[PDB]
Amino acid sequence: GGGPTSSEQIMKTGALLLQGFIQDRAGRELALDPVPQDASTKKLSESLKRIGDELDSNMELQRMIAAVDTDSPREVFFRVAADMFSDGNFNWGRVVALFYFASKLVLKALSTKVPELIRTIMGWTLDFLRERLLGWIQDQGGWDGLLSYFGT
Amino acid sequence: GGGPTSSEQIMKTGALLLQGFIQDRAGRELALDPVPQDASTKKLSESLKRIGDELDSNMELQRMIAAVDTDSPREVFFRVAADMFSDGNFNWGRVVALFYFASKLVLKALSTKVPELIRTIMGWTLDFLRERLLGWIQDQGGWDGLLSYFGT
Amino acid sequence: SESQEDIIRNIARHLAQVGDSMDR
Amino acid sequence: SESQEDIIRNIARHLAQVGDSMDR
């Protein structure tokens, strides 16, 4: 047992809202199993989503966020988190802003991962092509033969 | 020097088409620097794109592709590649299909990476929240306080 | 596993078939 | 580096400011 004021309920609900929120923004195929939740928690998810949408239309923020280097993203996360709350104040807007920042690190890490995956997979593909297909492709007179094949 | 039939031109153009093609499909924020190319190579890119689009509307294929497990994606790539060309035949359509398969492994790897990133970043965020913000959140009577804050 | 081997052969045959058909 | 430290403080102050303003 334990009401909304218990540390357990706070961590539990906190996990749900944050995951709901990050998954939501990271969807904008291969999608994610949405986070099942109650009526009040949906109402909260809904509102977080709106605040996040409004943050996305803040061009200053998006500029600086894209500007920052996420080679060591954990360092960045903790440095920003600490700086945000260092003046000893707390309010709901900063908590929301923190959640927003977390979702942006996800996207940012994802962005650096994409060209890595591509290069790796291209490596396999071009290795296969060179050792198995090159002979046949030369027989066509190179990729100019694919032009003919498409009609162009 | 070396015309379209040279192994050098075949590997070089091959790299360009494949990268162009994979990047194209992986875009459907944080986008990718497009691959600069000549008129003939653009014509080729254009056509590959169309064939890929037509492959995406092949529900059989998409079903099986999503069905396959990419724990060891290199193994999968080479097993499929070998099987596709094992009857000793070659044509342009299989080469296109191979490229298509490569782009799908990219998306598939990306999909498994997303929930990993999210969990990691949520770990940092919930660690910060529990040690730095929990006290204040309890003072609000838990997340029910965020409801009040949003007006609900 | 043994069924994954089946799904893989499947994907291959299908890709090969789609590629043979991209002609006409 | 030294400029990245600046971008990070910046992001923080901005996030804190946006959060202070989400009230009214």
Author numbering:
A (entry chain A), B (entry chain A): 10 to 37, 44 to 167
C (entry chain C), D (entry chain C): 76 to 99
From the study:
The intrinsic pathway to apoptosis is regulated by interactions between members of three factions of the Bcl-2 protein family: the BH3-only proteins such as Bim and Bid, which initiate the process, the essential effectors Bax and Bak, and the prosurvival members, which oppose the action of both other factions. Unlike Bak, which is constitutively anchored in the mitochondrial outer membrane (MOM) via its C-terminal segment, Bax is largely cytosolic in healthy cells and accumulates at the MOM only upon a death signal. Core/latch dimers of Bax and Bak form on treatment of the monomeric proteins with certain BH3 peptides and CHAPS, and Bax and Bak core domains form symmetric homodimers, supporting that unlatching the core domain is a necessary step to Bax and Bak oligomerisation and permeabilisation of the MOM. Bim and Bid are both potent direct activators of Bax, but Bim is less dependent on interactions via its ‘h0' residues than is Bid.
Earlier work had demonstrated that BidBH3 M97 contacts Bax I66, and alanine mutants at either or both of these positions reduced the capacity of the peptide to release the core domain from the latch domain. α2 in equivalent complexes, we crystallised a core/latch dimer complex of BaxI66AΔC21 with BidBH3. That structure is very similar to the wild-type complex, the largest difference being that the C terminus of the Bid peptide is disordered in the crystal, rather than folding back over Bax I66A as it does with Bax I66. In addition, a slight ‘collapse' of Bax α2 towards the core of the complex is evident in a 1 Å shortening of the distance between the Cα atoms of Bid M97 and Bax I66A (8.2 Å) as compared with Bax I66 (9.3 Å). As a consequence, the cavity in the BidBH3:BaxI66AΔC21 structure is reduced to a size not significantly larger than cavities found (for example) in the interior of the complex between BimBH3 and Bcl-xL.
